[PDB]
Amino acid sequence: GVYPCGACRSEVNDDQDAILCEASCQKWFHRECTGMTESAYGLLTTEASAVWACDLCVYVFTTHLANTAAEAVLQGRADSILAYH
Ligand SMILES: COc1ccc2nc(N)sc2c1
Ligand SMILES: [Zn+2]
Ligand SMILES: [Zn+2]
């Protein structure tokens, strides 16, 4: 991989789930280093309007917000994660 993970500092390879901090620092992170669920990653990364912000740093989601929003979506309590911005 070209980029190192914002959290653990090890390389991000193409076969690992990874998310870019587009809110600001523009660093790539392994999904598993952030604590983001597989569910949130799937929903966040497909949603063109949403961006992710790392713990140090168009609708912005932190990990915990993305996690909480996806749980609500999947329980049928919200229409998309954008509702949680
Ligand atoms: C290792 O330091 C970080 C920096 C940013 C960050 N963002 C997260 N969601 S976990 C995390 C950990
Ligand atoms: Zn990492
Ligand atoms: Zn950041």
mmCIF file of N, CA and C and ligand atoms in Angstrom:
data_model
loop_
_atom_site.group_PDB
_atom_site.id
_atom_site.type_symbol
_atom_site.label_atom_id
_atom_site.label_comp_id
_atom_site.label_asym_id
_atom_site.label_seq_id
_atom_site.Cartn_x
_atom_site.Cartn_y
_atom_site.Cartn_z
ATOM 1 N N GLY A 1 0.853 -1.234 0.000
ATOM 2 C CA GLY A 1 0.000 0.000 0.000
ATOM 3 C C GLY A 1 0.873 1.263 0.000
ATOM 4 N N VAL A 2 0.372 2.320 -0.573
ATOM 5 C CA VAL A 2 0.996 3.617 -0.604
ATOM 6 C C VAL A 2 0.810 4.435 0.710
ATOM 7 N N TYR A 3 -0.359 4.355 1.358
ATOM 8 C CA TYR A 3 -0.678 5.233 2.488
ATOM 9 C C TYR A 3 -0.578 4.480 3.824
ATOM 10 N N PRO A 4 -0.107 5.159 4.872
ATOM 11 C CA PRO A 4 -0.140 4.544 6.179
ATOM 12 C C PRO A 4 -1.409 4.904 6.966
ATOM 13 N N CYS A 5 -1.851 3.967 7.796
ATOM 14 C CA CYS A 5 -3.055 4.171 8.572
ATOM 15 C C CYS A 5 -2.854 5.298 9.567
ATOM 16 N N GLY A 6 -3.808 6.243 9.609
ATOM 17 C CA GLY A 6 -3.856 7.301 10.577
ATOM 18 C C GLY A 6 -3.797 6.939 12.022
ATOM 19 N N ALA A 7 -4.268 5.736 12.321
ATOM 20 C CA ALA A 7 -4.252 5.257 13.671
ATOM 21 C C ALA A 7 -3.103 4.394 14.023
ATOM 22 N N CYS A 8 -2.835 3.337 13.263
ATOM 23 C CA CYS A 8 -1.846 2.412 13.725
ATOM 24 C C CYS A 8 -0.458 2.644 13.074
ATOM 25 N N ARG A 9 -0.503 3.466 12.055
ATOM 26 C CA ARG A 9 0.712 3.804 11.251
ATOM 27 C C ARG A 9 1.300 2.775 10.327
ATOM 28 N N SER A 10 0.633 1.633 10.174
ATOM 29 C CA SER A 10 1.007 0.596 9.266
ATOM 30 C C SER A 10 0.335 0.753 7.948
ATOM 31 N N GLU A 11 0.865 0.143 6.892
ATOM 32 C CA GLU A 11 0.332 0.353 5.543
ATOM 33 C C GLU A 11 -1.112 -0.097 5.429
ATOM 34 N N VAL A 12 -1.852 0.638 4.594
ATOM 35 C CA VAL A 12 -3.228 0.319 4.190
ATOM 36 C C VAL A 12 -3.098 -0.353 2.816
ATOM 37 N N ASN A 13 -3.414 -1.642 2.774
ATOM 38 C CA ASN A 13 -3.417 -2.377 1.490
ATOM 39 C C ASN A 13 -4.746 -2.481 0.859
ATOM 40 N N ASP A 14 -4.723 -2.688 -0.441
ATOM 41 C CA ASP A 14 -5.978 -2.695 -1.211
ATOM 42 C C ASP A 14 -6.991 -3.747 -0.752
ATOM 43 N N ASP A 15 -6.527 -4.845 -0.191
ATOM 44 C CA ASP A 15 -7.452 -5.873 0.289
ATOM 45 C C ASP A 15 -8.027 -5.630 1.690
ATOM 46 N N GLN A 16 -7.675 -4.524 2.340
ATOM 47 C CA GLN A 16 -8.244 -4.195 3.677
ATOM 48 C C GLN A 16 -9.330 -3.096 3.537
ATOM 49 N N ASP A 17 -10.383 -3.176 4.376
ATOM 50 C CA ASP A 17 -11.400 -2.166 4.451
ATOM 51 C C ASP A 17 -10.688 -0.889 4.987
ATOM 52 N N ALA A 18 -10.848 0.206 4.287
ATOM 53 C CA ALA A 18 -10.236 1.454 4.715
ATOM 54 C C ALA A 18 -11.121 2.646 4.392
ATOM 55 N N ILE A 19 -10.982 3.654 5.225
ATOM 56 C CA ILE A 19 -11.807 4.874 5.092
ATOM 57 C C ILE A 19 -10.884 6.095 5.133
ATOM 58 N N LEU A 20 -11.212 7.099 4.313
ATOM 59 C CA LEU A 20 -10.468 8.341 4.250
ATOM 60 C C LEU A 20 -11.139 9.473 5.088
ATOM 61 N N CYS A 21 -10.334 10.139 5.908
ATOM 62 C CA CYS A 21 -10.780 11.268 6.667
ATOM 63 C C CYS A 21 -10.908 12.492 5.736
ATOM 64 N N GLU A 22 -12.038 12.619 5.105
ATOM 65 C CA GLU A 22 -12.266 13.713 4.174
ATOM 66 C C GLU A 22 -12.748 14.900 4.879
ATOM 67 N N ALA A 23 -13.043 14.789 6.158
ATOM 68 C CA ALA A 23 -13.473 15.962 6.906
ATOM 69 C C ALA A 23 -12.322 16.917 6.968
ATOM 70 N N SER A 24 -11.103 16.388 6.995
ATOM 71 C CA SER A 24 -9.978 17.274 7.139
ATOM 72 C C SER A 24 -8.593 16.735 6.823
ATOM 73 N N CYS A 25 -8.056 15.797 7.647
ATOM 74 C CA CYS A 25 -6.624 15.479 7.579
ATOM 75 C C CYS A 25 -6.219 14.693 6.323
ATOM 76 N N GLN A 26 -7.217 14.149 5.646
ATOM 77 C CA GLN A 26 -7.078 13.446 4.428
ATOM 78 C C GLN A 26 -6.120 12.251 4.604
ATOM 79 N N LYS A 27 -6.125 11.666 5.811
ATOM 80 C CA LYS A 27 -5.439 10.375 6.060
ATOM 81 C C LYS A 27 -6.370 9.195 5.940
ATOM 82 N N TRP A 28 -5.829 8.063 5.469
ATOM 83 C CA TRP A 28 -6.580 6.793 5.267
ATOM 84 C C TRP A 28 -6.417 6.067 6.583
ATOM 85 N N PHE A 29 -7.485 5.315 6.949
ATOM 86 C CA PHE A 29 -7.426 4.532 8.152
ATOM 87 C C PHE A 29 -7.961 3.106 7.856
ATOM 88 N N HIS A 30 -7.398 2.083 8.495
ATOM 89 C CA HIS A 30 -8.090 0.795 8.441
ATOM 90 C C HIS A 30 -9.383 0.894 9.109
ATOM 91 N N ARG A 31 -10.457 0.338 8.524
ATOM 92 C CA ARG A 31 -11.727 0.316 9.183
ATOM 93 C C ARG A 31 -11.601 -0.291 10.613
ATOM 94 N N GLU A 32 -10.883 -1.411 10.762
ATOM 95 C CA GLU A 32 -10.771 -2.041 12.102
ATOM 96 C C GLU A 32 -9.998 -1.217 13.114
ATOM 97 N N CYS A 33 -9.123 -0.308 12.683
ATOM 98 C CA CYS A 33 -8.536 0.567 13.662
ATOM 99 C C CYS A 33 -9.397 1.700 14.242
ATOM 100 N N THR A 34 -10.509 1.948 13.607
ATOM 101 C CA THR A 34 -11.348 3.049 13.972
ATOM 102 C C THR A 34 -12.448 2.641 14.914
ATOM 103 N N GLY A 35 -12.789 1.344 14.938
ATOM 104 C CA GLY A 35 -13.966 0.892 15.616
ATOM 105 C C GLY A 35 -15.262 0.974 14.882
ATOM 106 N N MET A 36 -15.206 1.379 13.616
ATOM 107 C CA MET A 36 -16.368 1.414 12.763
ATOM 108 C C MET A 36 -16.864 -0.064 12.503
ATOM 109 N N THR A 37 -18.168 -0.291 12.580
ATOM 110 C CA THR A 37 -18.746 -1.566 12.236
ATOM 111 C C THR A 37 -18.690 -1.809 10.732
ATOM 112 N N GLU A 38 -18.817 -3.089 10.367
ATOM 113 C CA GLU A 38 -18.886 -3.501 8.983
ATOM 114 C C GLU A 38 -20.169 -2.861 8.380
ATOM 115 N N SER A 39 -21.231 -2.731 9.201
ATOM 116 C CA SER A 39 -22.490 -2.199 8.728
ATOM 117 C C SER A 39 -22.384 -0.726 8.372
ATOM 118 N N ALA A 40 -21.814 0.045 9.304
ATOM 119 C CA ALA A 40 -21.547 1.456 9.065
ATOM 120 C C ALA A 40 -20.632 1.738 7.909
ATOM 121 N N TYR A 41 -19.569 0.951 7.770
ATOM 122 C CA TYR A 41 -18.667 1.106 6.639
ATOM 123 C C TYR A 41 -19.420 0.943 5.316
ATOM 124 N N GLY A 42 -20.251 -0.072 5.228
ATOM 125 C CA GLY A 42 -21.017 -0.314 4.014
ATOM 126 C C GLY A 42 -21.935 0.806 3.705
ATOM 127 N N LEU A 43 -22.657 1.293 4.705
ATOM 128 C CA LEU A 43 -23.560 2.422 4.502
ATOM 129 C C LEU A 43 -22.910 3.764 4.259
ATOM 130 N N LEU A 44 -21.798 3.985 4.932
ATOM 131 C CA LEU A 44 -21.128 5.290 4.833
ATOM 132 C C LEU A 44 -20.445 5.403 3.508
ATOM 133 N N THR A 45 -19.847 4.330 3.031
ATOM 134 C CA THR A 45 -18.963 4.421 1.892
ATOM 135 C C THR A 45 -19.765 4.487 0.578
ATOM 136 N N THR A 46 -21.006 4.036 0.623
ATOM 137 C CA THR A 46 -21.933 4.053 -0.540
ATOM 138 C C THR A 46 -22.667 5.409 -0.651
ATOM 139 N N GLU A 47 -22.633 6.198 0.422
ATOM 140 C CA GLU A 47 -23.404 7.434 0.529
ATOM 141 C C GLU A 47 -22.525 8.624 0.122
ATOM 142 N N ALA A 48 -22.588 8.948 -1.165
ATOM 143 C CA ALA A 48 -21.831 10.011 -1.788
ATOM 144 C C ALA A 48 -21.873 11.340 -1.035
ATOM 145 N N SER A 49 -22.982 11.637 -0.373
ATOM 146 C CA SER A 49 -23.064 12.891 0.344
ATOM 147 C C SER A 49 -22.356 12.910 1.674
ATOM 148 N N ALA A 50 -22.011 11.748 2.200
ATOM 149 C CA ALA A 50 -21.484 11.716 3.548
ATOM 150 C C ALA A 50 -19.985 11.615 3.521
ATOM 151 N N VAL A 51 -19.344 12.218 4.503
ATOM 152 C CA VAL A 51 -17.898 12.014 4.677
ATOM 153 C C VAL A 51 -17.627 11.645 6.131
ATOM 154 N N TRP A 52 -16.443 11.078 6.307
ATOM 155 C CA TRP A 52 -16.042 10.600 7.613
ATOM 156 C C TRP A 52 -14.970 11.519 8.177
ATOM 157 N N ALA A 53 -15.056 11.760 9.472
ATOM 158 C CA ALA A 53 -14.063 12.474 10.232
ATOM 159 C C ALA A 53 -13.447 11.565 11.262
ATOM 160 N N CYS A 54 -12.113 11.535 11.301
ATOM 161 C CA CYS A 54 -11.408 10.810 12.319
ATOM 162 C C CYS A 54 -11.470 11.483 13.663
ATOM 163 N N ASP A 55 -11.097 10.723 14.703
ATOM 164 C CA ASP A 55 -11.192 11.238 16.110
ATOM 165 C C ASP A 55 -10.379 12.527 16.345
ATOM 166 N N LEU A 56 -9.386 12.790 15.498
ATOM 167 C CA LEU A 56 -8.623 14.013 15.594
ATOM 168 C C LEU A 56 -9.249 15.153 14.864
ATOM 169 N N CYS A 57 -10.032 14.916 13.827
ATOM 170 C CA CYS A 57 -10.572 16.018 13.054
ATOM 171 C C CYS A 57 -11.996 16.464 13.520
ATOM 172 N N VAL A 58 -22.871 18.325 1.950
ATOM 173 C CA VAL A 58 -21.880 17.335 2.581
ATOM 174 C C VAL A 58 -22.067 17.169 4.100
ATOM 175 N N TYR A 59 -22.298 15.928 4.537
ATOM 176 C CA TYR A 59 -22.716 15.633 5.888
ATOM 177 C C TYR A 59 -21.598 14.787 6.533
ATOM 178 N N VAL A 60 -21.091 15.251 7.660
ATOM 179 C CA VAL A 60 -19.911 14.659 8.360
ATOM 180 C C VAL A 60 -20.304 13.661 9.444
ATOM 181 N N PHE A 61 -19.651 12.510 9.444
ATOM 182 C CA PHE A 61 -19.851 11.541 10.500
ATOM 183 C C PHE A 61 -18.571 11.144 11.161
ATOM 184 N N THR A 62 -18.515 11.110 12.480
ATOM 185 C CA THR A 62 -17.506 10.464 13.237
ATOM 186 C C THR A 62 -17.842 8.971 13.219
ATOM 187 N N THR A 63 -16.881 8.196 13.696
ATOM 188 C CA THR A 63 -17.102 6.737 13.806
ATOM 189 C C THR A 63 -18.343 6.437 14.649
ATOM 190 N N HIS A 64 -18.393 7.019 15.825
ATOM 191 C CA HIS A 64 -19.458 6.662 16.697
ATOM 192 C C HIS A 64 -20.785 7.064 16.158
ATOM 193 N N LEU A 65 -20.851 8.237 15.537
ATOM 194 C CA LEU A 65 -22.082 8.621 14.855
ATOM 195 C C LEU A 65 -22.472 7.728 13.719
ATOM 196 N N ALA A 66 -21.513 7.331 12.876
ATOM 197 C CA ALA A 66 -21.793 6.424 11.749
ATOM 198 C C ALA A 66 -22.329 5.089 12.305
ATOM 199 N N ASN A 67 -21.669 4.619 13.380
ATOM 200 C CA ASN A 67 -22.100 3.321 14.008
ATOM 201 C C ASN A 67 -23.508 3.377 14.509
ATOM 202 N N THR A 68 -23.806 4.458 15.243
ATOM 203 C CA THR A 68 -25.158 4.642 15.770
ATOM 204 C C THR A 68 -26.191 4.821 14.664
ATOM 205 N N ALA A 69 -25.902 5.606 13.595
ATOM 206 C CA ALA A 69 -26.781 5.752 12.523
ATOM 207 C C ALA A 69 -27.062 4.450 11.772
ATOM 208 N N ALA A 70 -26.037 3.627 11.488
ATOM 209 C CA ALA A 70 -26.256 2.409 10.747
ATOM 210 C C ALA A 70 -27.132 1.448 11.575
ATOM 211 N N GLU A 71 -26.933 1.407 12.895
ATOM 212 C CA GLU A 71 -27.722 0.510 13.761
ATOM 213 C C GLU A 71 -29.159 0.901 13.647
ATOM 214 N N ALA A 72 -29.424 2.206 13.716
ATOM 215 C CA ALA A 72 -30.818 2.739 13.541
ATOM 216 C C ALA A 72 -31.401 2.388 12.208
ATOM 217 N N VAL A 73 -30.640 2.538 11.108
ATOM 218 C CA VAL A 73 -31.074 2.141 9.725
ATOM 219 C C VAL A 73 -31.446 0.682 9.660
ATOM 220 N N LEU A 74 -30.596 -0.134 10.236
ATOM 221 C CA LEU A 74 -30.826 -1.584 10.114
ATOM 222 C C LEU A 74 -31.941 -2.100 11.025
ATOM 223 N N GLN A 75 -32.231 -1.391 12.094
ATOM 224 C CA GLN A 75 -33.338 -1.722 12.956
ATOM 225 C C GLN A 75 -34.633 -1.172 12.351
ATOM 226 N N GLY A 76 -34.549 -0.446 11.251
ATOM 227 C CA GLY A 76 -35.737 0.098 10.583
ATOM 228 C C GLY A 76 -36.242 1.375 11.246
ATOM 229 N N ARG A 77 -35.412 2.012 12.043
ATOM 230 C CA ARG A 77 -35.762 3.228 12.776
ATOM 231 C C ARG A 77 -35.376 4.538 12.054
ATOM 232 N N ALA A 78 -34.593 4.466 11.002
ATOM 233 C CA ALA A 78 -34.236 5.621 10.226
ATOM 234 C C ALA A 78 -34.244 5.271 8.779
ATOM 235 N N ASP A 79 -34.567 6.255 7.975
ATOM 236 C CA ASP A 79 -34.552 6.110 6.524
ATOM 237 C C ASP A 79 -33.169 6.125 5.845
ATOM 238 N N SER A 80 -32.159 6.817 6.393
ATOM 239 C CA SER A 80 -30.771 6.632 5.941
ATOM 240 C C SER A 80 -29.926 7.138 7.018
ATOM 241 N N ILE A 81 -28.647 6.949 6.856
ATOM 242 C CA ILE A 81 -27.796 7.409 7.890
ATOM 243 C C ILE A 81 -27.718 8.950 7.879
ATOM 244 N N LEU A 82 -28.062 9.552 6.733
ATOM 245 C CA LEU A 82 -27.970 11.050 6.583
ATOM 246 C C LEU A 82 -28.814 11.748 7.591
ATOM 247 N N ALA A 83 -29.847 11.060 8.102
ATOM 248 C CA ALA A 83 -30.716 11.599 9.108
ATOM 249 C C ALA A 83 -29.993 11.873 10.420
ATOM 250 N N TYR A 84 -28.815 11.253 10.617
ATOM 251 C CA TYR A 84 -28.224 11.330 11.899
ATOM 252 C C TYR A 84 -27.181 12.454 11.979
ATOM 253 N N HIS A 85 -26.950 13.186 10.874
ATOM 254 C CA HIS A 85 -25.851 14.111 10.773
ATOM 255 C C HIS A 85 -25.921 15.138 11.953
HETATM 256 C C1 LIG B 1 -4.350 6.330 16.746
HETATM 257 O O1 LIG B 1 -4.955 7.619 16.766
HETATM 258 C C2 LIG B 1 -6.197 7.746 16.203
HETATM 259 C C3 LIG B 1 -6.470 8.843 15.397
HETATM 260 C C4 LIG B 1 -7.720 8.988 14.819
HETATM 261 C C5 LIG B 1 -8.703 8.027 15.051
HETATM 262 N N1 LIG B 1 -9.999 8.048 14.536
HETATM 263 C C6 LIG B 1 -10.672 7.003 14.942
HETATM 264 N N2 LIG B 1 -11.943 6.751 14.610
HETATM 265 S S1 LIG B 1 -9.798 5.893 15.991
HETATM 266 C C7 LIG B 1 -8.405 6.932 15.867
HETATM 267 C C8 LIG B 1 -7.157 6.776 16.450
HETATM 268 ZN ZN ZN B 2 -4.556 0.742 11.121
HETATM 269 ZN ZN ZN B 3 -8.749 13.365 10.253
#
